[PDB]
Structure formats: C-alpha cells, structure tokens
A = this chain, B = another copy of it.
Amino acid sequence: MITVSIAGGSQPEILQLVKKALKEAEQPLQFIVFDTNENLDTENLWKYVHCSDEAAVAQEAVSLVATGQAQILLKGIIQTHTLLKEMLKSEPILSHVAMVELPAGKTFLLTDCAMNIAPTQATLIEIVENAKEVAQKLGLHHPKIALLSAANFNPKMPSSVLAKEVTAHFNDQQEATVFGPLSLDLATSEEAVAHKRYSGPIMGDADILVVPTIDVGNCLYKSLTLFGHAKVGGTIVGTKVPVVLTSRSDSTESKFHSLRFAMRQVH
C-alpha cells in the first residue's frame, strides 16, 4: 500500500484530488493530511492531523516521510519555500523531473523545468544523476540521456560547452548513455536522424532530455502541452521520497498525473 503525506491538505481542492484518487485507485492508497485549518473531511477519506502553526504542518508532513511511514510528500496549500526548507532541513541538490506522453505514444523524461535556474557543470551532473535514478527506477536499464543544445559544438555557445563537459564526465559509469550537444529533433526523432545522415550514441531514441536552463525546459514543457497535446506529470527528486509540488492554479488532472508518476516511482 502507498501512504501519501499532504502538507496543508485540508482544502476542497485537495479533498477533490484525494476523493478522485481513491476511487480511480488500482492499488491500496492512503492519505494523511496535516493542516492548521479545520478538517473538511467527514467521509473519512483521509487521516486528519491538526497543527498549531504552518511551520508545524511542514515539519509534521515531512517527518511522516522521513520516518518511513509515508512514501510520497504532496504539497497542498502551503508556501512552497516553507515546505522546501523543512524538506532540506531533513536532508543537497534537488531537481524537477517530468514525465511526457505524446499522442503517437512517444514518451520521455524532461528534467529541470522548475528547480535549478542556470545549472553549472557540477549541478548539471547531479541533475543527470537524479533523472538517471528515476529512469532506472521505472525499469529502464541503461537509459539514454541527451544533453540538449542548439549548437556540432560551438565554444561560443554555453549549452554546447556545458554539454561537452557533462559528456566527458559520464564517459565511464557504463550505467547509462549520456551524450551532448544534441538538438531536439536529433534526440527524439529517428526520422530526423536519417534525413540528416547523422550518427552518434543517441539517435532519436532518448529516454531522458536534459535542458541547459529552466527557460528551455519551461518552454519545451509548455509547448508540448499547448500545441503538442501531451500528458505531463512531474515530481521533485533529490530527497528520500518523491515530492509532488501542487499549485492552486494547477488543474487536478495535472497534479493527478504527477501523483501517478510519483506512485510509479514507488513501485
């Protein structure tokens, strides 16, 4: 069974997500909610735990995960940084990982469209490691990780430099295939690979895409959603448990996919 700890989850929006999950659940699921506000549940859909202050909520919610009682931390109505702080206070480099599903069934992981703004050599290596973990935790043995760049390698292009550097680093592990600079088409389309007579480690069949900055990841993330009609779900990695960041403006169906994504990582 899977127990989800929700920080500040005694809100109708959360209640609605929980109610939905429990009914569409194909496996045992349980929610434990911490909140300063009064309980809104009567149908005993979750386990309510009142808290004195918000700081306590974050503390209590994170504790349930650190102690090994809950396997997923969900961010309800609470300041992202207050919960983020407590998270780290329990732990060094966190990164966001999203799961993308395109119409024809094409899928891939997209990493860091929220956390690290302008990843340096050292931070990008860690970002690759976290995504490497998430993949090799969903079954993908020896996953292909492409370092995205608009650069043929051009020293005047930061993403190109960063890519050639991160590539040299993982040229040992043998646990995964990490290569870049690689243009988007050359990492996701095998047709682009032939039409361009290209040959390399990754030929339009990457399992994970790593961006140079959040600007690139955010853009790609939104374009796949707006015009690509793709299903997406993401979680924050780096801690001993998958963390789902939810915003009021986010749809339930989106934060739902993230929830299932967090669930698949527990399996």
Contacts and interface: CB of A to CB of B under 8 A. Distances in A.
A152 to B, nearest CB: 10
Interface string A166-187: 0000000000000000011100
Contacts of A235: none
Contacts of A228: 223, 227-228
A266 interface: no
Nearest to A223: B223
A214 B157 contact: yes
A190 to B, nearest CB: 11
A41 interface: no
Given A227-B228, A228-B227, A249-B196, A184 B118 contact: no
Interface string A34-53: 00000000000000000000
A222 B251 CA distance: 26
Nearest to A159: B215
B113 A223 contact: no
Contacts of A230: 227
Given A219-B216, A219-B219, A227 B102 contact: yes
A218 interface: yes
B226 A227 contact: no
A226 B188 CA distance: 9
A158 interface: yes
A35 to B, nearest CB: 20
Q: Quickly give the copy total for this chain.
A: 2
A219 B148 contact: yes
Most buried by B among A103, A214, A227: A227
A117 interface: yes
A150 B249 contact: no
A10 interface: no
Interface string A201-229: 00000000001111111111011111111
Given A117-B156, A195-B251, A196-B249, A150 B223 contact: no
A226 B148 contact: no
A-B pairs with lowest CB-CB distance, top 10: A150-B218, A227-B228, A196-B249, A184-B222, A223-B223, A150-B214, A150-B215, A215-B216, A219-B220, A216-B219
Given A183-B222, A215-B216, A223-B223, 20 more contacts: A102-B227, A103-B227, A117-B156, A148-B215, A148-B219, A150-B217, A150-B219, A184-B223, A189-B226, A195-B249, A211-B215, A211-B219, A213-B216, A215-B215, A216-B216, A219-B220, A219-B223, A220-B220, A223-B224, A223-B228
